[PDB]
Structure formats: structure tokens, C-alpha cells
Amino acid sequence: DQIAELLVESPLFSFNCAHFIAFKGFRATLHGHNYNVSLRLRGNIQGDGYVIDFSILKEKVRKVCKQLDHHFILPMYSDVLNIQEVNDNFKITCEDNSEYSFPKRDCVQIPIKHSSTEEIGLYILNQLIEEIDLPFLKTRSVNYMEVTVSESPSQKATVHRNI
Amino acid sequence: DQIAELLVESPLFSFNCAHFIAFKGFRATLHGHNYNVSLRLRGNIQGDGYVIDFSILKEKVRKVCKQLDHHFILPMYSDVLNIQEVNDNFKITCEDNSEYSFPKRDCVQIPIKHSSTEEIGLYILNQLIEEIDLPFLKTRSVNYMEVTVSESPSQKATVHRNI
Amino acid sequence: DQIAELLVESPLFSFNCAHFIAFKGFRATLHGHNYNVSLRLRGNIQGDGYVIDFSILKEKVRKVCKQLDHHFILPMYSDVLNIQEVNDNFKITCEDNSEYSFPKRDCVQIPIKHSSTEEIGLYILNQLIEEIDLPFLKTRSVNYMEVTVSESPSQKATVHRNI
Amino acid sequence: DQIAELLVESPLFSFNCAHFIAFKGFRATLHGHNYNVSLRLRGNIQGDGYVIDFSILKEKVRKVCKQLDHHFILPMYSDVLNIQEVNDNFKITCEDNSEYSFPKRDCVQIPIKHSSTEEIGLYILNQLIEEIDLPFLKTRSVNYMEVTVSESPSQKATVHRNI
Amino acid sequence: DQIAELLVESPLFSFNCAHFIAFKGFRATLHGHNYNVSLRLRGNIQGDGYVIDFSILKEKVRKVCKQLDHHFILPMYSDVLNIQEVNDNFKITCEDNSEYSFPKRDCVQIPIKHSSTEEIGLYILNQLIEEIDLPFLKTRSVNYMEVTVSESPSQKATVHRNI
Amino acid sequence: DQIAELLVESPLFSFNCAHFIAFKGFRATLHGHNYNVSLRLRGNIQGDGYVIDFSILKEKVRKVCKQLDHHFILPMYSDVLNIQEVNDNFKITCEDNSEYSFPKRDCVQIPIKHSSTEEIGLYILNQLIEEIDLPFLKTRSVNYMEVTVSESPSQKATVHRNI
Numbered sequence: 003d004q005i006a007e008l009l010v011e012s013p014l015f016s017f018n019c020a021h022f023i024a025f026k027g028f029r030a031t032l033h034g035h036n037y038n039v040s041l042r043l044r045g046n047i048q049g050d051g052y053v054i055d056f057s058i059l060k061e062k063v064r065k066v067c068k069q070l071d072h073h074f075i076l077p078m079y080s081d082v083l084n085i086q087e088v089n090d091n092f093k094i095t096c097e098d099n100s101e102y103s104f105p106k107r108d109c110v111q112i113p114i115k116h117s118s119t120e121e122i123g124l125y126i127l128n129q130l131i132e133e134i135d136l137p138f139l140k141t142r143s144v145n146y147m148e149v150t151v152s153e154s155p156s157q158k159a160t161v162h163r164n165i
Numbered sequence: 166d167q168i169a170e171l172l173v174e175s176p177l178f179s180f181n182c183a184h185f186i187a188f189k190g191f192r193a194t195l196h197g198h199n200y201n202v203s204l205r206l207r208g209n210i211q212g213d214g215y216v217i218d219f220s221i222l223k224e225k226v227r228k229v230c231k232q233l234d235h236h237f238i239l240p241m242y243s244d245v246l247n248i249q250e251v252n253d254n255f256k257i258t259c260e261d262n263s264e265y266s267f268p269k270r271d272c273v274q275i276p277i278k279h280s281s282t283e284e285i286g287l288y289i290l291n292q293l294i295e296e297i298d299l300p301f302l303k304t305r306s307v308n309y310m311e312v313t314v315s316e317s318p319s320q321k322a323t324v325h326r327n328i
Numbered sequence: 329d330q331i332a333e334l335l336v337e338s339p340l341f342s343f344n345c346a347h348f349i350a351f352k353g354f355r356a357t358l359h360g361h362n363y364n365v366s367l368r369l370r371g372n373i374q375g376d377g378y379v380i381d382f383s384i385l386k387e388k389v390r391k392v393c394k395q396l397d398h399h400f401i402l403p404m405y406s407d408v409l410n411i412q413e414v415n416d417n418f419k420i421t422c423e424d425n426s427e428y429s430f431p432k433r434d435c436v437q438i439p440i441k442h443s444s445t446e447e448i449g450l451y452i453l454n455q456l457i458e459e460i461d462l463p464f465l466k467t468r469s470v471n472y473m474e475v476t477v478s479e480s481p482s483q484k485a486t487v488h489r490n491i
Numbered sequence: 492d493q494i495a496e497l498l499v500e501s502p503l504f505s506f507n508c509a510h511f512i513a514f515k516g517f518r519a520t521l522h523g524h525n526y527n528v529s530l531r532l533r534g535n536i537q538g539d540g541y542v543i544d545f546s547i548l549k550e551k552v553r554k555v556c557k558q559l560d561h562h563f564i565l566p567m568y569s570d571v572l573n574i575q576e577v578n579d580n581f582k583i584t585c586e587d588n589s590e591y592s593f594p595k596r597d598c599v600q601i602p603i604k605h606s607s608t609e610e611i612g613l614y615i616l617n618q619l620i621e622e623i624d625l626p627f628l629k630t631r632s633v634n635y636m637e638v639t640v641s642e643s644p645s646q647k648a649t650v651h652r653n654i
Numbered sequence: 655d656q657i658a659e660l661l662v663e664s665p666l667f668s669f670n671c672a673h674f675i676a677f678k679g680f681r682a683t684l685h686g687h688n689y690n691v692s693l694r695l696r697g698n699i700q701g702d703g704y705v706i707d708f709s710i711l712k713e714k715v716r717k718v719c720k721q722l723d724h725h726f727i728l729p730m731y732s733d734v735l736n737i738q739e740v741n742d743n744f745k746i747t748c749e750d751n752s753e754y755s756f757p758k759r760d761c762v763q764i765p766i767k768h769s770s771t772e773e774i775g776l777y778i779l780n781q782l783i784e785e786i787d788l789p790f791l792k793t794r795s796v797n798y799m800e801v802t803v804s805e806s807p808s809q810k811a812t813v814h815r816n817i
Numbered sequence: 818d819q820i821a822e823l824l825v826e827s828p829l830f831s832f833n834c835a836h837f838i839a840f841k842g843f844r845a846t847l848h849g850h851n852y853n854v855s856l857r858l859r860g861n862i863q864g865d866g867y868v869i870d871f872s873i874l875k876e877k878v879r880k881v882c883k884q885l886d887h888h889f890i891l892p893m894y895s896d897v898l899n900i901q902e903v904n905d906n907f908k909i910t911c912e913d914n915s916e917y918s919f920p921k922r923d924c925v926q927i928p929i930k931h932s933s934t935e936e937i938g939l940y941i942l943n944q945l946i947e948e949i950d951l952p953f954l955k956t957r958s959v960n961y962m963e964v965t966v967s968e969s970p971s972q973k974a975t976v977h978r979n980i
């Protein structure tokens with residue numbers, strides 16, 4: 003068996019989102035990014051000549067990205083945000099008493115503590131493994147999945163899981 | 166006299182901002198972009214061997230970009246937004262009755278009608294001409310200034326002025 | 329009224345095709361390219377804040393590209409190819425008596441003389457104007473349409489029409 | 492001894508080829524790509540200050556690429572193609588009875604089963620090791636050779652050998 | 655007749671040179687750049703399907719670049735450098751009495767006043783027109799030649815001539 | 818604890834320098850490059866949501882690059898250069914008796930043997946670890962630091978240290 007490593011990356015694996023960083027003793031102003039996601043994996047070349055079909059990887063990266071795209075990214079588990087439900091909005095109050103309010107539908111609530119590149123990457127890695135399907139990955143012999151998320155062209159975080 | 170056209174462009178001429186599009190009968194969800202700005206100009210090669218020093222162009226593009234960077238871009242002259250001052254926030258109400266509220270300090274109020282790439286480009290062109298200084302441009306023989314703004318790598322608007 | 333120039337470009341505006349160059353006294357071997365298409369246009373900024381919506385330009389460039397993608401590009405009007413219909417294939421005979429045969433369904437017959445970048449560009453420009461629709465372009469005030477086609481990252485042809 | 496990893500990559504390490512994918516129960520239409528090859532290696536920094544001279548790596552990557560460039564890539568060992576020699580052409584018949592015919596000189600016969608990126612990568616890795624020369628690599632202390640092949644900017648396969 | 659505009663550009667159209675800027679009241683320290691050159695032209699599509707063959711443009715841009723590559727660029731006509739021939743070296747004395755000495759063979763003497771991007775561009779434009787040959791350009795119907803030179807990815811000068 | 822790998826890279830992490838290669842039996846002519854530096858590291862995601870703040874990495878890469886930028890890179894420990902102090906210049910004599918002279922202030926003396934990409938990379942890795950501060954790195958849980966230096970877009974050397 004011959005090992006190969008596949009990489010899929012594209013301006014199309016994008017989610018254009020608003021966010022702000024907040025942690026103890028610090029709060030950034032509201033802003034946004036064209037986040038970009040690449041996926042790298044490793045398996046054996048199968049009898050059909052692929053480790054896994056690029057088209058499927060492109061399809062599922064696109065799908066995960068599309069869920070986040072055009073939303074404010076709202077961390078569910080932050081210890082420094084007070085997140086209130088007010089009518090059809092989320093009202094967010096910070097430790098410096100700064101206050102924000104967005105329509106709930108404008109927000110994507112993600113099970114992370116900080117809208118950092120690192121934590122977004124871990125979330126996307128887990129979602130990608132679910133969307134492509136872990137049993138399907140194993141039928142193709144894939145044993146390594148790795149996600150890189152960039153906030154901008156100049157700063158990236160990369161996380162992996164051995165499967 | 167020999168004409169030359171200068172172009173300055175960089176991942177550094179960036180402003181990472183939140184915005185949303187709204188015009189009659191339409192409203193986008195809140196999101197954001199890594200906007201990128203390039204500047205192109207035309208003049209004669211001067212006795213010092215430059216049309217104008219690249220370093221100055223880089224300095225002033227950086228300065229304009231830095232004013233917008235890390236803010237929500239708020240159009241001053243929109244006919245479809247109701248912009249209210251509430252304590253230290255701007256409260257924005259849309260035609261579909263969607264409601265947003267941001268700290269005023271998180272916002273940059275710009276004299277445009279829509280936070281589109283085109284209108285942002287016209288604004289930045291005017292600001293760049295002021296920052297570099299129109300008389301200084303004319304001492305260097307510059308007769309054309311042109312700004313390109315990209316919302317993402319795949320979509321750009323370009324505006325110019327003959328000076 | 330303020331003029332703006334819009335550019336849309338992307339790794340997504342691609343057609344991955346086979347072709348070969350043939351003209352009098354010359355014939356290239358069969359090969360292929362990831363062709364890439366960009367579109368540039370000029371009009372006035374409309375009351376909605378756009379010259380024309382980027383999404384529409386992306387949609388129609390994608391559509392034209394998709395018709396050509398994954399096919400052998402077969403020039404209809406070449407003076408140096410003998411193109412024969414044999415069962416469900418096109419058989420192509422060159423001036424040096426070289427012979428090719430492809431399933432007709434693997435081929436896209438294009439009303440050009442040479443599968444050059446220049447002639448492909450003129451064809452795509454005409455198709456893009458039809459797909460976006462010339463009357464619709466004029467309602468948005470667009471007066472200039474320009475297509476760039478690249479055979480590879482290092483060689484491009486650009487054609488335009490004043491409308 | 493200090494380890495260093497060298498990477499050579501360029502738009503010049505290209506082969507612009509036609510191909511089609513075929514495996515059991517599937518056949519793509521004829522098309523093509525600007526394939527691109529990068530080479531990465533690891534060794535110790537030698538007394539001359541190089542692990543190995545970049546110029547040699549560039550020379551040999553260029554040479555391998557040039558053998559494939561401007562040809563139809565024909566897999567020698569496919570279990571789903573019937574490859575016939577007819578006069579000075581190869582006639583290829585697929586499982587769905589689709590038929591192709593190319594001049595033999597337009598084709599490069601490669602000892603692979605599928606013209607996939609993965610299998611092309613393994614072939615190029617083996618050829619690069621022969622062209623640079625395995626004993627010469629070992630005199631420079633190189634212990635790792637790795638090839639990345641891209642079908643297009645957005646999809647790549649990477650293979651390696653420990654030497 | 656249909657007009658087309660051709661562009662050739664590549665990491666290969668490079669000259670990696672040392673230089674320093676000097677003009678009245680100013681002198682930069684010795685340093686260097688990977689200069690990059692692109693060529694754009696305009697003519698009619700000819701009966702062979704090309705305005706002019708890309709391969710020729712690539713060949714001649716390469717040739718001009720190769721003459722400059724791996725040398726110190728020495729302006730022949732500077733009003734602020736004292737250039738002395740000392741044995742087999744050029745000794746250069748600046749207005750601040752700074753002194754440099756290089757082997758003559760390490761230098762390329764260019765008929766410019768300043769080693770600026772603008773003046774280098776004008777020189778390369780003139781050399782490219784000579785290398786491709788002005789009569790040959792006119793037989794292909796080319797009526798516009800334009801050169802862009804970049805000192806680094808972020809700063810470029812563009813010059814043209816109507817022929 | 819979750820591991821993440823951070824990458825910072827930018828056209829801004831540049832030093833535009835002159836140099837020449839010399840080793841036993843060989844000497845290159847004087848020339849230069851836009852060198853580019855990227856930094857990759859690995860640690861655990863901290864309670865603030867970062868492995869380490871990108872801004873600090875960008876700040877210190879910039880600082881190291883700025884020390885080298887706009888200078889001739891002069892290796893301190895070369896066995897094939899005779900480096901003489903003459904008034905306020907360094908005079909360099911090669912094994913073929915070629916002679917150079919530069920103002921000392923135009924030169925950066927680096928504790929390397931060859932101005933190769935590999936040795937420059939090892940030097941920059943060591944300097945980056947000092948500038949960011951090794952104890953500070955360990956408080957953020959960083960256990961791996963890796964530097965890539967490119968002489969041009971097409972040739973790179975990568976070195977690392979486990980900390």
C-alpha cells in the first residue's frame with residue numbers, strides 16, 4: 003500500500019463573518035474577516051486510483067463554510083460575555099459594560115469559548131469529520147484529518163485528529 | 166518628459182471590518198471582510214528618478230486603511246436605515262424592522278449611502294487625495310489617481326479622478 | 329453620476345479542457361489547460377449602491393465556463409482540419425495526415441477557427457453578453473465589457489466590446 | 492549537523508496535458524490540466540553552505556515535467572481500458588464502449604493504472620530520484636524526498652520516500 | 655479585424671540584482687531585489703489565430719532579464735555618482751563621500767540616471783522592442799507595447815510606447 | 818489540552834539585501850534578493866483562546882527582518898573570504914582575487930559561514946527565539962519553532978528547533 007496526502011484549498015472555502023475577540027481584561031471592537039479553510043488528509047491510494055475523490059472534499063468543506071458565512075460568530079461558552087435573549091435578538095454585554103445587539107438569525111452560535119482562529123479550527127475539524135462521515139472516511143483508509151483556518155492571508159491556525 | 170504609472174498594493178493595505186448591505190427591498194445579514202486597497206497613479210518621472218516615492222504612497226494608504234480597520238462601517242446617508250443615538254451606542258433599524266445596536270466607538274461613520282465596494286472606493290479615493298495632499302501631488306506632476314477596493318480576492322471595484 | 333469599474337475573477341471561473349493548436353504549416357500535439365476567465369466592466373453606480381451585483385456576474389461567468397469545462401475544444405471553422413462525423417465520434421485529420429478520434433459528447437464545437445486564447449476570449453465575451461443579457465446590462469448602465477482568458481498563469485489574452 | 496528542509500516550486504514545473512479518468516463503473520470525458528510539481532527534501536547543511544544546490548533541483552524537476560508536457564497521459568496498467576495499436580495511433584476503448592484514437596507520438600505511456608494526481612505523483616517521485624541520482628542525493632546527505640502534484644490550484648496530492 | 659491585448663508574466667521574468675538609490679541630498683545603503691518584468695501588448699488577431707506567439711514574448715523577456723540578472727545595476731548617467739575605473743573594478747564615490755568598489759564584471763552599466771523602477775522600466779521597454787524587433791512587431795500588427803517592472807510584489811512602475 | 822500550529826507569513830516579513838555566494842572553488846557575482854520569512858510554531862490553546870497572539874509574532878518577525886533589510890549580508894565565519902577593515906569600509910577579497918569594498922554601515926555582519934538560505938534561516942530562527950523570548954514562549958506552552966526563508970518565490974529553506 004502507498005500512502006498519499008491530499009490537500010484541498012480554494013478562495014471558495016470561505017466564510018465572510020463578523021466577530022470580536024474578548025477574553026479576561028480585553029475586548030476588541032466589532033469587525034470581520036474573509037475566513038478561509040483548507041483540508042489536508044492522509045490514506046492509501048485505493049483501487050479506483052484516489053485516496054478519496056476531491057469532489058466530495060470540496061463539497062463538504064463548502065457546506066460547513068456556507069453555514070458560517072454571512073453571520074456574526076457567537077461563542078456559546080465564553081466566560082467573559084453575558085449573552086441575553088431579547089425578543090428576536092441576542093444582546094451581548096462585555097466586562098467593560100459595552101453592549102451589542104444583533105438579530106438571532108444574523109448570528110451563528112458555535113460551541114466555543116472564543117471566536118479565535120484556533121477554536122474555530124477545532125470546531126470546523128469536528129464538523130468536517132461529521133459531514134464527510136467518519137465511517138466513510140475509514141472505508142477509504144483515511145487515518146489523518148487536518149484543518150487550517152486563516153483569518154487573513156497572513157495568519158493561520160492548523161489543528162488535526164488521528165482517526 | 167516620460168510618463169510612468171505607479172501601482173502600490175499589499176496585504177498590508179487592509180481594513181478588517183463588519184458591515185451589512187441594505188437597499189430598497191433588501192437587507193443582508195451582519196458579516197465582514199478583509200477589505201484590500203490598491204492605488205495606481207500617473208505622472209512624469211522627476212529629476213530624482215521617481216514619479217513619487219513609493220514609501221509615501223504606502224504610508225498614506227496605510228493611514229486611511231487604519232482609520233477604517235477593526236470597525237463596523239456605518240453609512241451616514243442611507244435612505245433605508247434609521248440610525249438612532251442611544252446612550253453610547255448607535256441603534257440601527259432596517260425596513261424589515263430588524264434591529265442592531267453597536268457601541269458608537271466600534272463604528273466608523275462614513276459619508277456614503279451604502280457600504281458597497283464601489284462607494285467605499287469613492288470615499289477612499291477622496292481621502293487618499295487629501296492625505297497625500299493635492300498640491301503635493303501636483304508638484305510631483307501626478308495627473309491621475311485611481312483606487313481599487315476588494316471585498317474579497319474575487320470581487321473588486323475601481324474608481325478614478327483626473328487631477 | 330460616478331463611473332466605477334468592476335472586476336470578477338476566481339479559481340472557480342475555470343474550464344479544464346483538452347485542445348491542440350493547428351494552423352498552416354504547424355500542428356501541436358494533444359494536450360490541455362486549466363483555462364481561467366476574468367470579467368471586467370464599467371458603468372455608473374446605481375441607487376442601490378452597485379454598478380451591477382457581483383453575484384450575477386459570478387453566476388454567469390460560472391455558467392459559460394461550465395459549458396466548456398471537461399471537454400475537448402473543437403474549432404468549427406478551421407481551414408486546416410478535416411472534421412468527419414464517424415458513428416458517434418468526430419474524426420479529425422490534420423494537414424500532416426495525423427488522425428484523432430473523440431466521442432462527439434467529449435467535444436464542444438465552438439464557432440472559432442483556432443483554439444487560441446484570443447479566439448476563445450472573443451467567443452466567451454460574446455457568450456457572457458448573451459448570458460447576462462444585453463438589455464439587462466443597459467438597464468444597469470454598463471457601457472464596457474472585457475474578458476481576459478488565461479491558458480496558464482503566465483499567458484493571457486484580453487478582448488473588449490463597447491456596448 | 493544541522494537539518495534543513497528545501498522546497499522548490501514554480502509555475503515553470505508544469506506539464507500541460509490531456510487525460511481522462513476511468514475506473515470500474517466510471518469514465519470522465521476527455522479534458523486537460525496545467526499540472527504543477529513541487530519538490531521538498533531534507534538533509535544536513537554541507538560545508539559549501541547548501542543541503543543541495545537549488546539549480547540542480549530546478550533543472551531535474553524541469554526535465555521530468557518536460558517529458559510529460561504537451562501530451563495525452565496514457566496509463567499502461569489500467570484494468571478498464573482496452574489499448575490497441577492501430578497504424579501509428581493508440582486506439583482506446585472504454586467499458587461503456589466509448590472509443591478514442593490518438594497518434595502514439597501525442598501520448599506518453601506511463602507505468603500507472605489511473606491518470607490520477609496520486610499515481611502521477613508516485614511516478615514523478617520515482618523519476619525525480621532517478622534523474623537527480625540516488626547516490627548523488629546520498630553524497631549530499633539527503634534522507635527524504637517528497638513530491639506534490641497539483642491538477643489545478645485547488646487540489647493536490649503529496650507522496651514521499653525515505654532514502 | 656479584432657483587437658486583442660496579450661499579457662505575459664512569470665516568476666521566470668526575473669533579475670536578481672543589487673543596487674542603491676542616490677539622488678541630490680540622498681543615498682540609500684547597498685541592497686537588492688528580485689525584480690520582475692511583465693509585458694503587455696495590443697494588435698489584431700492574425701490568420702494563424704495569434705496576435706503574436708506567446709513563446710517568442712517569453713523568449714525575449716527572458717533574454718533581457720538574463721542580461722541584468724545576478725549583477726549590480728550601475729547607472730551610466732547619474733549626476734550624483736563619481737564612477738571611476740580602477741584596475742578591473744568600478745569605484746563609486748557618493749556626495750556624502752561614501753565609497754564602493756565592485757569588479758566591473760559584477761556590474762551592468764545601463765544608460766539611465768537612477769536605478770529606479772521607473773527608469774529601469776523605460777530601459778527594458780526599449781530593449782524588449784529591439785530584441786523582439788520592431789519590424790517583426792509591425793508584421794504581426796502590434797501597435798502598443800507596455801512594460802511593468804516590480805522591485806518587490808508591492809511596488810511597480812509601468813511605461814508604454816505607441817508603435 | 819488541544820494542540821494547534823500557528824503560521825505567520827506576509828510580504829511584510831522581508832529583507833531586501835545584497836549578497837554573493839562563495840565557497841571553495843566557486844564565487845557568484847554580486848546581486849540581491851527580496852528575502853521573505855515565515856514563522857510556524859506549535860503549542861496548546863490557552864485560556865485566552867490563543868496559543869500565542871499573532872500580533873506579537875508579526876511584531877518580532879518584523880523586527881528581525883528590519884535589522885537585515887537594506888544591507889549587504891556579510892558572513893563573519895567564511896573560510897574563503899578575506900575580510901579587511903579599511904577606514905570606514907569592509908574590503909572583501911575572494912579566492913580568485915576579486916575585490917569588493919563597501920561602507921561598514923551598508924553591511925550586516927552575521928555569524929554564518931555562507932550567505933545561503935539555509936544558514937540565514939538558522940540565524941533568523943535563533944534571533945526570533947531571542948526576540949520573542951524563550952521563557953515567554955514556554956509560558957504560552959510553545960514547544961516547536963520553525964522558520965522558512967525564501968530567496969525568491971521559487972526556492973525556500975526551512976529549519977526548526979524543539980524547545
Ligand SMILES: Nc1nc2nccnc2c(=O)[nH]1
Binds near residue numbers: 023119120867869
Ligand atoms: N493566536 C491568535 N491571535 C490573534 N490575534 C488577533 C486576532 N485574532 C487572533 C487569533 O484568532 N489567534
Ligand SMILES: Nc1nc2nccnc2c(=O)[nH]1
Binds near residue numbers: 186280283377380382
Ligand atoms: N457590485 C457589488 N455587488 C455586491 N454584491 C454583494 C455584496 N457586495 C457587493 C458590492 O459591494 N458591490
Ligand SMILES: Nc1nc2nccnc2c(=O)[nH]1
Binds near residue numbers: 444446703704705706
Ligand atoms: N498568442 C498565442 N500564443 C500561443 N502560443 C502557444 C499556445 N497557445 C497560444 C495562444 O493561444 N495564443
Ligand SMILES: Nc1nc2nccnc2c(=O)[nH]1
Binds near residue numbers: 008052608
Ligand atoms: N483524489 C482525486 N480525486 C479526483 N477527482 C477528480 C479528478 N481527479 C482526481 C484525482 O486525480 N484524485
Ligand SMILES: Nc1nc2nccnc2c(=O)[nH]1
Binds near residue numbers: 216217771
Ligand atoms: N517611485 C519610486 N520609489 C521608490 N522608493 C524606494 C525605492 N525605490 C523606489 C523606486 O524605484 N521608485
Ligand SMILES: Nc1nc2nccnc2c(=O)[nH]1
Binds near residue numbers: 543546968
Ligand atoms: N541550496 C541552495 N542553493 C542555492 N543556489 C543558488 C543560490 N543560493 C542557494 C542557496 O541559498 N541554497
Ligand SMILES: [Zn+2]
Binds near residue numbers: 021022
Ligand atoms: Zn478578527
Ligand SMILES: [Zn+2]
Binds near residue numbers: 196197316
Ligand atoms: Zn459583505
Ligand SMILES: [Zn+2]
Binds near residue numbers: 360479
Ligand atoms: Zn495549449
Ligand SMILES: [Zn+2]
Binds near residue numbers: 522523524
Ligand atoms: Zn482531470
Ligand SMILES: [Zn+2]
Binds near residue numbers: 686805
Ligand atoms: Zn531598492
Ligand SMILES: [Zn+2]
Binds near residue numbers: 670836837838848
Ligand atoms: Zn543570491
